[PDB]
A paper describes a structure:
The first gene encodes the nucleoprotein (N protein) which associates with the viral genomic and antigenomic RNAs to form the helical [name]. The paramyxoviral [name] assembly entirely covers the viral genome, protecting it from detection and degradation by host factors and serving as the template for viral mRNA transcription and genome replication. Here, we determined the [name] structure of the recombinantly expressed, full-length, and tag-free HeV N protein in complex with [name] host-derived RNA. Following [name] data collection, a multimeric HeV N protein double-ring assembly was resolved to 3.5 Å resolution, enabling the building and refinement of an atomic HeV N protein model.
The HeV Ncore structure follows the common bi-lobed paramyxoviral N protein fold and includes the Nt-arm (Met1-Thr32), NTD (Thr33-Glu260), CTD (Glu261-His370), and Ct-arm (His371-Ala394), as well as bound [name] host-derived RNA. The [name] map of the HeV N protein assembly fully resolved the N protein core (Ncore), however no density was observed in the map corresponding to the intrinsically disordered C-terminal N protein tail (Ntail, Ala395-Val532). The N protein surface is overall hydrophilic, with three prominent hydrophobic patches that are covered by neighbouring N protomers in the assembly. The Nt-arm alpha helix (α1) contains a strongly negatively charged, solvent-exposed region facing the central cavity consisting of residues Asp3, Asp6, and Glu7. The HeV N assembly map showed clear density for single-stranded RNA in the RNA-binding cleft that separates the NTD and CTD, which was modelled as a poly-uridine; one hexa-uridine per N protomer. The RNA molecule is positioned in the conventional ‘three-base in, three-base out’ orientation, similar to other paramyxoviruses. In the case of HeV N, the 3’-most three-base stack is oriented in towards the RNA-binding cleft while the 5’-most three-base stack are oriented towards the solvent. The charged RNA-binding cleft consists of a cleft floor and two ridges that follow the orientation of the RNA chain. The cleft floor consists of the NTD-CTD-connecting loop Glu260-Ala265 continuing into α12 until Arg272 as well as the α14-containing stretch Ser317-Gly326. Within the RNA-binding cleft, a series of conserved basic (Lys178, Arg192, Arg193, Arg352) and polar (Thr181, Thr185, Gln199, Gln200, Tyr258, Gln319, Ser344, Tyr354) residues likely interact with the RNA chain through putative hydrogen bonds, salt bridges, and hydrophobic interactions.
Numbering used by the authors:
A (entry chain A), B (entry chain A), C (entry chain A), D (entry chain A): 1 to 394
The structure:
Amino acid sequence: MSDIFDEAASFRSYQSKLGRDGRASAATATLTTKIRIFVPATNSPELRWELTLFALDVIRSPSAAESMKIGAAFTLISMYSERPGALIRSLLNDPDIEAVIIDVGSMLNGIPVMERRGDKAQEEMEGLMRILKTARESSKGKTPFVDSRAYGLRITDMSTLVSAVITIEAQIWILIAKAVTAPDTAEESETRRWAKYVQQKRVNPFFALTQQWLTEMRNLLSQSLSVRKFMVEILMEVKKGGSAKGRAVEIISDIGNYVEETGMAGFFATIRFGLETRYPALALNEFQSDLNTIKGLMLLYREIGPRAPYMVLLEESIQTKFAPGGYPLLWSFAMGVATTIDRSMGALNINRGYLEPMYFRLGQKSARHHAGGIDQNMANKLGLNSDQVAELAA
Amino acid sequence: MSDIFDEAASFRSYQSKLGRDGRASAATATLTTKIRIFVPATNSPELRWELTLFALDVIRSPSAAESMKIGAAFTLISMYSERPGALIRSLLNDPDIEAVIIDVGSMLNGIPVMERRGDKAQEEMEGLMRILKTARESSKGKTPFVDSRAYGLRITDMSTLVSAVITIEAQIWILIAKAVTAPDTAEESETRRWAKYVQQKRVNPFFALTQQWLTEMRNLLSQSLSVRKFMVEILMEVKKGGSAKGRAVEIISDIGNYVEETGMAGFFATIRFGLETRYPALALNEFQSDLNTIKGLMLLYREIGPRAPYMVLLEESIQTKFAPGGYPLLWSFAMGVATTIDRSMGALNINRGYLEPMYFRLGQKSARHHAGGIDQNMANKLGLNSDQVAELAA
Amino acid sequence: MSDIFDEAASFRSYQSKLGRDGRASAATATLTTKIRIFVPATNSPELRWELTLFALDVIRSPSAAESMKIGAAFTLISMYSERPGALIRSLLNDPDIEAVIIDVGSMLNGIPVMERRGDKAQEEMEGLMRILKTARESSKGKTPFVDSRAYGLRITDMSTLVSAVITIEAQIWILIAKAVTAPDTAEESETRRWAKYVQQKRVNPFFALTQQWLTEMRNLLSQSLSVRKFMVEILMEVKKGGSAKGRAVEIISDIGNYVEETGMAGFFATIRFGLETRYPALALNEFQSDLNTIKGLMLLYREIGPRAPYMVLLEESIQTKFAPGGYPLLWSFAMGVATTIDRSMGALNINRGYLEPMYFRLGQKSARHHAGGIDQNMANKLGLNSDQVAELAA
Amino acid sequence: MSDIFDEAASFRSYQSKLGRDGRASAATATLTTKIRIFVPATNSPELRWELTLFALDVIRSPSAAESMKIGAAFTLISMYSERPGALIRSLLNDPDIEAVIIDVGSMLNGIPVMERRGDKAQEEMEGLMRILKTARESSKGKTPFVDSRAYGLRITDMSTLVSAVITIEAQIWILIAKAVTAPDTAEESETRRWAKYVQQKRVNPFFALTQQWLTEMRNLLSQSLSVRKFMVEILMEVKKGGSAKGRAVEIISDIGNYVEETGMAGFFATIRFGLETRYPALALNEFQSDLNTIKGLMLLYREIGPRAPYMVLLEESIQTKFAPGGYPLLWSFAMGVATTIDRSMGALNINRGYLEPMYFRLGQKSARHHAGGIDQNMANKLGLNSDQVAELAA
RNA sequence: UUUUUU
RNA sequence: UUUUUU
RNA sequence: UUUUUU
RNA sequence: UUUUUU
RNA sequence: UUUUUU
RNA sequence: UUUUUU
């Protein structure tokens, strides 16, 4: 009767937020891994330049352990800040890892431990020398930068160090946009971002890393989750306005503008196209369940919080519920109308197992052959029937 | 049902202002660069004239470091004020740089440090002499001014110094309008502004810098963000009325009238043409999402504050969300009707990847062949059907 | 009549807080002096030990400039903190001086500048070498510590460094109690404090500086006001409870317990003895004005704020109004009863020009020969007349 | 007039809580020392017995570093708990030190590191062997226990291990009562406590450590503040009732009953004797200031919190204000009446510099020759005048 | 600063 | 201005 | 700490 | 930017 | 990202 | 799970 079909809606709403309530216990505590991070102790430009060169070499090194690579990545990311240790310690929310901040102090060819020399330090020094030697020998004499003069470059001016560091941060931060979604199909959007930032003169093109180093760093970023979590935390903190933003922070926020809502193109495309742009072909007895699921998904997305856009980057378990597969019909309709309407829509790889070609064809027809689609008109267009006819005439 | 398609609007509104709340921490502090600024200590016209000649030479100098160029630019901009040091210190909001104000004191061919002569001063003196020599030799004997007599000119009268300084400030401030949007396509609007100010007799044409110096200064301004931030802060402070405005301040505000809303022509054109000038072809099921996005953008623009018009100049990350690409359909419609209606509209370079030629054609037709477009008439024009027919007859 | 003698009280109350209202302008800005502070960049014990040895040598050095001595003192005081630069920058309220924090980085015999070596650094290195040589030659081969082995001691363990640093901070902080009140008559209370802290095992007596170095440091502390202001700010910050206190902080607070209310023994003795311990000889027509002045002084002291106890250390101008001389009669009475009652009271040098021997004799008599002094008894001692007689019998 | 002498009370009350308000900053952060703690990983009795034997040897060792001694003490104290690591981590509030909990795992003659054997482990093994050898050689073949058979004793039963561990904890916890007050004058009250616990059969006398080991451990406890802080935290946590108490916890609480209010005998004796036991000789114009100070001290003690009784153990700076010296007159009176009344009172060493023999004699007379001291009688003893006379007749 | 008993 | 004890 | 009666 | 009348 | 006029 | 544009 009347009561049923509403009890169903309440049941689905309750099932969506079924057990996602309360607070968990500390028993489910992940084992922690020690990660050694080399941060610059002082503000001298030469020390910071040598440190970032060392971090580039370590990241490029093939014999480097994963923990050393994560340490080098953390050193690189926090290089712009005047207090990298404070930035790392105050913007770390990774239960998987524990970070031991190490102030570099002075600067040799590698790093001088300067803590009980001879006792448990010489082995670390030889290890760092081996890492550097393997990094330099692995490449065919090619420096990490696309320009050989950028590697063996002496930096003593603060402005030059700042420019080079900003360029390195920009080139690193380009990769996060398509690091886990489709790392193989990258180097096109990344090149577009690099060209955009070069044309804006925000980055000096002299310090441009080669594509081999970029591929290695992207592979490291995709393999590791702690680096992604740290960078997402940095993005969230920068997104919060209120204070003055520096050049590095502004570049990071501009990149995060592209980073947001990555890996969830299906859901947002479904929203924008199938749900909005109201077409008379919506209520047809095969889209009502999908509409209810979509509404529940919007409520869940609002409930998640500030980490919702970067759900794929943090690899949230909630992301699976957002993926198409629970609403294949409306999703297929929406991507059909998207591919017919948006030219850019159509390069997306959507050869899934629930394509529903009938509904894709229905959406394709609904986009063009359906009708002009005159929605409720606040202004009284009494004589616009001929206008609608002319618009549909194309 | 009824509830859906409104939950969507609330979801998009919440997603727009998703994480832009709260206050950030001091951990994300950009590394600061020392910038040396030479300000005139006294009000003697000869000292100020020599100082601005030195600043012109330093800016024109090719061997000058970037920090020295920024110092010379800051010296030039604050030259009009009777207390340049106070103006710089009370109108600086650049976290990227720290300014060390240096009172010039006396005036030699370069600048006399007059602080422990011999100790850490002789090297600076030789450096300044090298800068001046390189600046003079780099040009083919051409002075920065278009008139050779304007360079080696003795100034002892306050009025002549004021006139020359005002001319230099005007010619510098013309460049900010098209410094980052399209610096290459400049020298047309800049020449138009210069002709306008010459015809108004606000600037004395004798102190007219050559186009080579203007190109060098524009390149420096585009490369550097601190100078842009300082000049935008000056524009914002001058825009606030209430006090008496001097000739320099009035010229600066008149230039800022053109400076405002630069680099965002797409968004404002979309507003003015597609949104306003209500055409019966608006509600057609492919513009509703764009309308919602545009409304959210207006709310965001109102929320930003007084820095909203100069978003491109400060290179805000929020500017990316305002750029066309998130609403290509309504944007294309609006630029179509603009190019058909506004003659000046059409010189804009809009060969983007989301042009949507079908909607551009639809807007072109909507501008002329659609209808006369009679909106709600407060006055009862019962007999104006023939008037509308005659108006449409063209 | 009745109205008069109350208008007088209101007049004196208004005269006390006559012009101490409103906010001052920035025109009265003291000229600032640059002070170079060498802080340890890292946490390595050897670097910190070498740095504090260098600071001890600089303080002991006779050829050192005053600014260098203040820098060495600031380096010494903030040595215990893990972030000396942050502690100095967040606890500095000295308009007289500006502090340029310098991270030491590495550690040579002196300090390596490690910033454009050769350019404006070699002269500083030779200056530091001259400072060290003069410091070592000035003494008759005597190390700053009372033990010659404590100077040329290698420190690699964190615990030993912490113990030595705590001892040095304690021995430095003993001097502030009697640095400006009576520096010449010191070395008795200072020795008592040192013995107290040795018996408590809070300080290791091996790192005990000689008395010559202590005298030099006390002279430097008395000469300089910025060091006193910084140490008073540290005392005020430590006094505020709420957080966990370390060994250094606990020692500093324990010393500040003695530091408080220094240099104002006359006023507080007058309060405690003349005002409290109510004697029938108070209201005698020569103490009413002094009572009114004392009440006004209490109101002023409450109004001053948290800096009231350390008024002599900061050399407040308000301290002059608190000194005896505006109420010599009641002050003389109070010191008379104090010298008769308190055995320790009597070592105070009070041979002032307003001693009023008649009132001193009156107080001496009031202490003993006056009466037993039975105040209002809450418990009804109906039979205690004989008890009072026996008590007065002595 | 009437207003004065109350403004004085308000002034003293405000001066007592002068600057003890607000929250301190993190700039005043003490440097932290790494402390290595060896905790038993499993519950096997043999492993725990070997671990506590090793800790006893390390504490007795003269060549052991202070950090190793603190680690051994922490291992000993938390030995009773089934999860020593959790107990240490959840009951540590020492900003001076950082604790790195180390699970022992297996058990060799010393401790097997069992973490990358050969790499940075062999040196630690040789160090532990040297520590054990020096500990065994330093003594004249004397085991830490008073019985030679208790050292080389095999423990495989859980009950025997529990009994031995409880005995060791008891003998360690006896020392805290007089570790910092008068460690030299100990071994009398400690022997009395040991005899009390032996007569109660709570501790098995077979595991009785020799007096040399007890003296060494007491010296270590007096030297170190972190161990005292940890043990005081344990005492505070145990004092909070509500849960079931084990034998070790009950013994610890019984010992803490004696531990409480240590090192503050002067203040509490002054309270109990001078303030309570109301004598007609109180209000005599030389005790009113002391009464006000005592009231302020009671308010401060109530305001301090649960850490108030163990103020001397934590070496609070607030303890100095509680010590006699700010109220020598009432203190002398109270100790006089105490020495006349309480037989145990009189062994206290009170040969201070502010004894005031006149007031001590006055208190001695007030105790006996003053009067019977009949206070307000709720029951109407109309005929008890002869009873009071007989009571005074003695 | 502290030196009792409990 | 200041010269004790704590 | 405790040493009665009940 | 401005180019009338008043 | 941006390329008009004002 | 993901593969557009921005």
